[PDB]
Design a binder for this molecule. Structure first.
Ligand SMILES: CO[C@@H]1O[C@H](CO)[C@@H](O[C@@H]2O[C@H](CO)[C@@H](O[C@@H]3O[C@H](CO)[C@@H](O[C@@H]4O[C@H](CO)[C@@H](O)[C@H](O)[C@H]4NC(C)=O)[C@H](O[C@H](C)C(N)=O)[C@H]3NC(C)=O)[C@H](O)[C@H]2NC(C)=O)[C@H](O[C@H](C)C(N)=O)[C@H]1NC(C)=O
Length: 327
């Protein structure tokens, strides 16, 4: 904890409200790419579970030209998440021949956008034929909205399978778990970043799981930001932690179906917080879960776990897994 990132993050938001007003302060999250440009007068927001691509501007002077350029930028940007500050209005020149959204959003024509020529056209279509308006209360906000292909999620999840597969055998963790979580945590968003700076596809925070993992493997110190914005490594690492919550921390839990529930919950709020729903004594806790049927452990973790986020998440990961279980 020697960051000082907090000071920038705090003035990013305020830079926003200075222009957008407190009510219109939208910002990057796990399931939402959001990038300001044009001195914070322009927003490119990808929503990875809706999954829409609203581009808005509030510049007074030439709204279209401002919008235009965001559309082309969002549609063509290559998925280099490491070269990308989702907290500056600085230009992350990430134009690639291999767009991150290629396969995930289409022309009005119905084709994939790959080069500036179609990107320009999809843009120009939308500015002449899909433009919209709302108000701050103060200024008009001009908006374009783009829906992504209906299976954008499993089209996005496809990038990370080779990674999930490798990490699943290395550590012993079911890919289904890895995907369920990865899905639930980021909707497969490589740009994913939390308010509590959990990072990347598996929403991993450097100074808890990232430390403990690095502490296995035999690595003094702590995972780099770039490191977690490598899908290959973030998936390595979230998985490594899943292994860990199961071998050590929640390994005193007898029943493996019960243990998984603990693991999942724990993956989101810590093993200490899981065990602490039964006893403040980590042994007594394990003893009590072994008193139970995996369904009552589920129904406990789902009803009595202190975090709202963590109760609503078990059903999310447990449910996503059922889908991923079969091949
Ligand atoms: C929405 O996305 C966010 O998700 C990630 C998961 O995706 C959330 O991050 C999880 O947050 C947990 C903190 O809430 C964190 O667990 C804490 O983990 C550490 C590390 O293992 C535990 O401390 C270790 O504890 C053992 C003792 O059991 C000691 O041996 C170790 O030495 C400790 N090691 C280190 C390095 O500290 C900590 O538990 C201990 C025991 C404790 N009682 O303090 C554990 N927390 C709790 C309550 O038990 C997870 O590590 C992390 N998961 C991942 C993958 O990173 C994130 O949560 C935030 C930060 C939150 N809950 O507010 C999610 N949410 C947001 C909003 O961003």
């Amino acid at each position: 904890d020697t960051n000082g990132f907090d000071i920038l993050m705090g003035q990013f938001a305020h830079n926003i409200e200075n222009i957008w007003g407190f009510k219109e302060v939208v910002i990057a999250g796990p399931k939402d790419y959001v990038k300001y440009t044009d001195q914070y007068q322009t927003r490119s927001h990808i929503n990875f579970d809706d999954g829409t691509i609203t581009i808005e501007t509030i510049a007074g002077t030439e709204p279209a030209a401002h919008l235009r350029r965001a559309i082309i930028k969002t549609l063509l940007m290559g998925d280099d998440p490491s070269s990308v500050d989702l907290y500056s209005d600085v230009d992350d020149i990430t134009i690639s021949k291999e767009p991150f959204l290629y396969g995930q959003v289409v022309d009005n024509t119905g084709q994939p956008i790959r080069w500036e020529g179609r990107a320009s056209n999809f843009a120009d279509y939308l500015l002449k034929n899909r433009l919209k308006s709302r108000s701050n209360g103060l200024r008009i906000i001009y908006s374009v909205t783009i829906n992504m292909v209906p299976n954008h999620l499993d089209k996005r999840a496809h990038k990370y399978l080779g990674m999930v597969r490798q990490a699943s055998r290395k550590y012993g963790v079911d890919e289904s778990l890895i995907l369920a979580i990865m899905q639930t945590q980021s909707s497969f968003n490589p740009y994913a970043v939390s308010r509590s700076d959990a990072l990347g596809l598996m929403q991993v925070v450097q100074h808890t799981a990232g430390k403990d993992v690095f502490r296995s493997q035999g690595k003094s110190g702590t995972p780099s930001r770039s490191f977690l914005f490598d899908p290959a490594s973030n998936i390595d690492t979230g998985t490594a932690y899943l292994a860990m919550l199961n071998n050590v921390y929640l390994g005193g839990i007898d029943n493996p179906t019960s243990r998984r529930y603990a693991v999942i919950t724990a993956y989101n709020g810590g093993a200490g917080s899981v065990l602490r729903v039964f006893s403040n004594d980590k042994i007594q806790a394990a003893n009590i879960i072994n008193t139970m049927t995996p369904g009552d452990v589920y129904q406990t973790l789902t009803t009595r776990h202190p975090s709202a986020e963590s109760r609503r998440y078990l059903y999310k990961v447990n449910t996503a897994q059922k889908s991923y279980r079969r091949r």
